[PDB]
Amino acid sequence: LVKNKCVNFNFNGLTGTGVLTESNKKFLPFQQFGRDIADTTDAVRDPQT
Amino acid sequence: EFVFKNIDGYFKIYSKHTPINLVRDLPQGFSALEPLVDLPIGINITRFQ
Numbered sequence A: 001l002v003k004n005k006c007v008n009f010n011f012n013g014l015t016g017t018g019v020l021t022e023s024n025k026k027f028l029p030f031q032q033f034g035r036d037i038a039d040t041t042d043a044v045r046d047p048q049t
Numbered sequence B: 001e002f003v004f005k006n007i008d009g010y011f012k013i014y015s016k017h018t019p020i021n022l023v024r025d026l027p028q029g030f031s032a033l034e035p036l037v038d039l040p041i042g043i044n045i046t047r048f049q
């Protein structure tokens, strides 16, 4: 897991490009994804970590 | 409260548990069910007991 650097990211066949930093917002155990108001994939949960 | 729905090949169970101050009926207040279990089964049901 690399953080603070723009890097291509692939999670379970989903690919996006960005800088990945820890998100203060917390979600319930069932959820595996987070989205923005524009229906964009704003946040993720690392599968391994 | 548990809500059961069968769609697109897999059975789904959603449960939220809350204590209620007043015995009569069900609370007017809004509580949202959180998925507890999702089961992938192809079973069909037209009756429940």
Ligand SMILES: *[C@@H]1O[C@H](CO)[C@@H](O)[C@H](O)[C@H]1NC(C)=O
Binding pocket: B044, B045, B046
């Ligand atoms: C599923 O249930 C419905 C209603 O009983 C029935 O029409 C259908 O044939 C059942 N099985 C399958 C494989 O579709």
